[model samples]
Target: GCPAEQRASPLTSIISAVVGILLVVVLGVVFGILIKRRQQKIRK
Candidate 1:
């Protein structure tokens, strides 16, 4: 699944890793908050 004709640089990898991590973290945090809210609602 790799293209030998095309070459990649380190900058893309760095940005990709940073943005991917942040995106995952944001999703996780939002999901966690939603779960907490649901739990609280159920408790009430």
Candidate 2:
């Protein structure tokens, strides 16, 4: 990595935040599905 202090553009920062939020949401949904399936299997 360069040691220079390069500033990020405002648009880039906004997109990064959006992607971060979407990633968290996706992970949450995936984990929820996995847990739901596991619970159903355990009841069989």
Candidate 3:
């Protein structure tokens, strides 16, 4: 789906790739960390 995303110009495609990848990836990592912290608090 991301690969097929259309853009107005070549720069937009590159920009999309850069931000989109970072956005999804970092958000997932942060979410996982928060979940783990909550579990640790519960166990403690």
Give one digit per residue, the lDDT tens place, for model 1 in 1-44. Answer: 76545367868778878999999999899989998777855453
lDDT of 3 by residue, 1-44 (tens): 46765648879878879899999989899988988777755463
lDDT of each: 0.80, 0.83, 0.81
- Model 3: lDDT of residue 3: 78
List residue ranges in candidate 1 displaced over 4 A: 3-6, 40-44
- Per-candidate clash tally: 0, 0, 0
Ranking by TM-score: 2, 1, 3
Candidate 2 structure quality by residue, lDDT tens digits, 1-44 = 77736587769878888999999999899988998777855464
Would you estimate the TM-scores of all the predictions?
0.59, 0.60, 0.56
Taking all chains together, the TM-score of candidate 1 against the true structure is: 0.59
Q: Candidate 1: what lDDT?
A: 0.80
CA lDDT for candidate 2: 0.83
Clash pairs (backbone) in predicted model 1: none
Ranking by lDDT: 2, 3, 1
